[PDB]
């Protein structure tokens, strides 16, 4: 039972792996943006959209992960393990949660088609040599 | 934030708490029925239903957690802490995943209203003292 | 000014005294059920139903009682009184609040007529000798 | 839970707090006017009004509390603690029952909108400094 | 850029200076009244009225002032300054916030025209010698 | 109470927190543009708009705070505490007044929807890592 989280929204991991791992903003920033622009419709009793249902599950799961992190941080006596698993969550789980939260928050702000074309437009731009690419990097709009 | 995993589905965490932790089947037997009944809907390019999206995200997160578990298992250098956090993943995390998987699979199988009426009825029966509790517990069945 | 709490809902204390004092589930369980299935319509600014207005007053009053209990538990120096009144609230006030909360929560879940007939159906069953009664005890439904 | 005894009646606990604790008449004089004006509606098999149901439950609860009080009085074996908790029932519980009885009896007598406008007006008058406070306090009257 | 807060509501500082500085009830009482009769429509996402928008800003600003007061009360080592600025906020800023909150809360309860005439009716009464004025001081109504 | 200065204007404090404290211009340059563009609307006997009323109250409150500041300056007898609380007024209070003035002036100038879309876009750009952040930051302009 292997399932791409991005498959039902017309994306793929290979498409989000197209943008640099340094292009996705932090989990804190992404979570704060979700809290500022969409906290009410994320705590609503309705299936606002397929993009809303996914973001809710994602936030709850990152929460579970950080809870595990704190449990290791308090209930492990060993300082070696206590560091290792928390640094593993913060970075190795960090990227795939940064790509998930970025993608769904962007499809809410700018629309799915706008975010699926920015993934191909910005990706093909980063690959064009700088002497031949529009001087300014793409950004999301409207 | 204060989001409830069951709020969009007519339920809440405390409504599902009408069932004891012993009621819910194992994660492995929940994933075994997800693959047996809905592997072609889960692995498809369609948002069949909200339940389908939620269950997909849930399976992918259980996967991430178990991967953490295996990583701590093969990459940690202290047997005692390794063991102690793998206990966290299988038990202290397992109960809430066995309830989210249980709800989304049973809703796909019997329909949302049915599963919610079932929660309410099982609740009435478990609050009934055992000396007066009829020996047929409520059950979800296709009939 | 002597008033039966169950009189306006077609019941009587003699009718609720028909079911065993061990048949009513605990105050904690009843309060948790009210919180899980009806907390929103109990905190609403409307007279949802005559059954809703009564349950609200009941919860608030059990609250007052448990507050008195804690006041005895903290502000009485004497351990004898401090035990005695709290055990008196937990058991002697416990049953009549278990019957009240059970009755109104059941009339919300299953309907008043359904709960008034279950009180006569289950009562007459417990009195029939076991060799001649349907093998399975009644339960509330629909 | 966070239920307000006045929320279904267009009021709140802090709206009724516009009146000082000294304003409310005694529990015994509140029960004396409940029996004088509405013993046949309170003791009936009809839910005349939401106010009637609320007042019924209230009287039955004051009764339970006073029964506790008398029980602690005749069954406790320490005069000091007995006395000290009977003080709790008559004073520290009495104020909120003298305000719930006061509101439901005055609403039955003058109608809900009247009683609420009265709360607001008495509030305006009590916030007015005494040097400028007109000597006629607001009052509920049948006219 | 000098602006009367009362100018857009048909009042003036000279009109509110007409009633004694002892006639306005305390900030605590005024704030409690706002919390009891209008807390929901003051926390709403709509411009309920020009009188509502002003009261919100006023409450938030008195809050800022009392925050400054507590900052002096905790972060100043000197007990002389720590007393002086807090007593200055409580009394010298106290009156103009008591007049503001009174005025807007009254225009909500009794209507703007009712509160603008009570300011002239009560003011002219306090100035009439007691032998020739209606025996009872005016009060707001309806 | 829990009132938000931006809740009636389609915004919230955490939505405006998409912009860093360094972004907002000085209080004096905010008051200089308020007088340059809207001194005849602010000083008028009309409630032109909700924005106008809010900005009026805001300016009058900044005035009160600065007056406190000057009073502590000329009337306090300890240079150290005087200085230390004037720092409070100009810095620890200045940021939230430079954001309330900034929002109400920019809404008067460009219209509410524009300013809110701008907050969202600037947010997207600031969350973008600098290595991929296009050198044109978003800006409000009459065009």
Residue whose entry in the numeric block shows the structure tokens 């560091």: A83
Q: Touch between chain D and chain E (3+ CB pairs, < 8 Å)?
A: yes
What are the structure tokens assigned to A130, written together?
A: 């700088």
d(CA B129, CA C135) in angstroms, rounded, equals 17
Chain C touching partners, 3 or more CB pairs below 8 A? B, D
Find the CB nearest F132 among A23, A30, A37. Answer: A23
Q: Which of residues 109-128 of F touch A (CB under 8 A)?
A: 120-121, 123-125, 127-128
Residue whose entry in the numeric block shows the structure tokens 């709140």: D12
CB C9 within 8 A of CB C83: no
Q: Which of C111, C104, C137 is nearest to C20 (CA)?
A: C137
State which residue of chain E sits closest to D126, comparing Cα positions. E25
Which experimental method was this entry solved with? cryo-EM
Rg (CA), chain F: 17
Q: Tally the residues of chain E.
A: 142
**A70 contact B CB<8A:** no
Cross-chain Cβ contact A29/F135 below 8 Å: no
B80 contact partners, CB below 8 Å, separation of at least 6 = A78
Q: Looking at CA atoms only, how far is residue E117 from chain F in angstroms? A: 18
Q: Where are the alpha helices (DSSP H) in E1-142?
A: 13-16, 27-42, 50-75, 79-88, 94-110, 112-127
Residue whose entry in the numeric block shows the structure tokens 């529009």: A134
d(CA C97, CA B48) in angstroms, rounded, equals 47
CB E93 within 8 A of CB E65: yes
What are the structure tokens assigned to B111, written together?
A: 């329909």
Residue whose entry in the numeric block shows the structure tokens 């047996």: B36
Cross-chain Cβ contact C122/B132 below 8 Å: yes
Strand ranges (DSSP E) for chain A? none
Q: Which of D98, D11, D1 is nearest to D50 (CA)?
A: D11
DSSP state of E90: I
Q: Looking at CA atoms only, how far is residue E10 from chain D in angstroms? A: 22
CB B93 within 8 A of CB B65: yes
State which residue of chain E sits closest to D15, comparing Cα positions. E36
Q: Which of B70, F45, D141 is nearest to E3 (CA)?
A: F45
- Backbone φ and ψ for F133, nearest 5 degrees, come out as -80, 115
What are the structure tokens assigned to F55, written together?
A: 């900005």
Find the CB nearest B8 among A2, A47, A92. Answer: A47
Rg (CA), chain E: 17
d(CA A92, CA A84) in angstroms, rounded, equals 11
What are the structure tokens assigned to B5, written together?
A: 């995993």
**F36 contact E CB<8A:** no
CB F11 within 8 A of CB F18: no
Q: Is the dihedral of CA F81, F84, F86, F89 positive or negative?
A: negative
What are the structure tokens assigned to F43, written together?
A: 């000083």
Find the CB nearest C57 among D2, D57, D84. Answer: D57
Q: Looking at CA atoms only, how far is residue E1 from chain D in angstroms? A: 34
Q: What is the DSSP string of chain F?
A: ----TTGGGT--HHHHTTS-TTTSPPHHHHHHHHHHHHHHHHTSSS---HHHHHHHHHHHHHHHHHHHHHHHHHH-S-HHHHHHHHHIIIIITHHHHHHHHHHHHHHHHH-HHHHHHHHHHHHHHHHS-GGGS-SS-------
**F81 contact E CB<8A:** yes
**E140 contact D CB<8A:** yes
Chain A touching partners, 3 or more CB pairs below 8 A? B, F
Q: Strand, helix or coil at B128? A: coil
Find the CB nearest C5 among D50, D56, D96. Answer: D56
d(CA D10, CA D27) in angstroms, rounded, equals 23
Q: Strand, helix or coil at A31? A: helix
Q: Touch between chain A and chain D (3+ CB pairs, < 8 Å)?
A: no
d(CA F55, CA A21) in angstroms, rounded, equals 43
C67 contact partners, CB below 8 Å, separation of at least 6 = none
Q: Touch between chain A and chain F (3+ CB pairs, < 8 Å)?
A: yes
d(CA B9, CA B104) in angstroms, rounded, equals 9
**D96 contact C CB<8A:** yes
Angle at which helix B112-127 crosses helix C27-42, to 10 degrees, equals 140
Cross-chain Cβ contact B8/A45 below 8 Å: yes
Q: What is the DSSP string of A79-112?
A: HHHHHHHHHHIIIIIHHHHHHHHHHHHHHHHH-H
State which residue of chain F sits closest to E3, comparing Cα positions. F43
Q: Which of A58, A127, A134 is nearest to A93 (CA)?
A: A58
Q: Which residues of B touch C35 (CB under 8 A)?
A: 14
Q: Touch between chain D and chain F (3+ CB pairs, < 8 Å)?
A: no
Q: Which of F27, F37, F86 is nearest to F58 (CA)?
A: F27
Residue whose entry in the numeric block shows the structure tokens 């009664």: C133
**E32 contact D CB<8A:** yes
Q: Which of F131, F137, F124, F125 is nearest to A23 (CA)?
A: F131
d(CA F11, CA A50) in angstroms, rounded, equals 25
Find the CB nearest E80 among F5, F47, F77. Answer: F77
CB D99 within 8 A of CB D115: no
CB F65 within 8 A of CB E64: yes
Mutate to test the interface with D, among C30, C85, C104, C112 (most CBs of D within 10 A): C85
Find the CB nearest B132 among C33, C106, C137. Answer: C137
**C139 contact B CB<8A:** yes
- Element containing residue A67 per DSSP (H, E): helix A50-75
**E12 contact F CB<8A:** no
**E21 contact D CB<8A:** no
D84 contact partners, CB below 8 Å, separation of at least 6 = C75, C76
C26 contact partners, CB below 8 Å, separation of at least 6 = B127, C98
Q: Looking at CA atoms only, how far is residue E5 from chain D in angstroms? A: 23
**A133 contact F CB<8A:** no
d(CA D133, CA D127) in angstroms, rounded, equals 9
Cross-chain Cβ contact A29/F127 below 8 Å: yes
Residue whose entry in the numeric block shows the structure tokens 């997800």: B34
Cross-chain Cβ contact C137/B136 below 8 Å: no
d(CA D139, CA C18) in angstroms, rounded, equals 48
**C20 contact B CB<8A:** yes
Cross-chain Cβ contact F132/A136 below 8 Å: no
């Amino acid at each position: 039972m292997d399932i791409d989280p991005y498959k039902e929204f017309g994306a793929t991991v290979e498409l989000l792996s197209f943008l640099p791992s340094d292009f996705f903003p932090s989990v804190r920033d992404l979570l704060d943006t979700a809290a500022a622009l969409y906290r009410d419709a994320l705590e609503s009793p309705e299936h606002c959209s397929p993009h809303h249902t996914a973001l809710r599950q994602a936030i709850l799961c990152w929460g579970d992960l950080m809870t595990l992190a704190t449990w290791v941080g308090t209930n492990l006596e060993d300082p070696a393990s206590r560091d290792l698993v928390v640094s593993y969550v913060n970075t190795n789980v960090g990227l795939k949660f940064r790509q998930l939260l970025w993608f769904h928050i962007s499809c809410l702000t700018f629309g799915r088609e706008t975010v699926l074309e920015y993934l191909v437009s910005f990706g093909v731009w980063i690959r064009t040599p700088p002497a031949y690419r529009p001087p300014n990097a793409p950004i999301l709009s409207t």
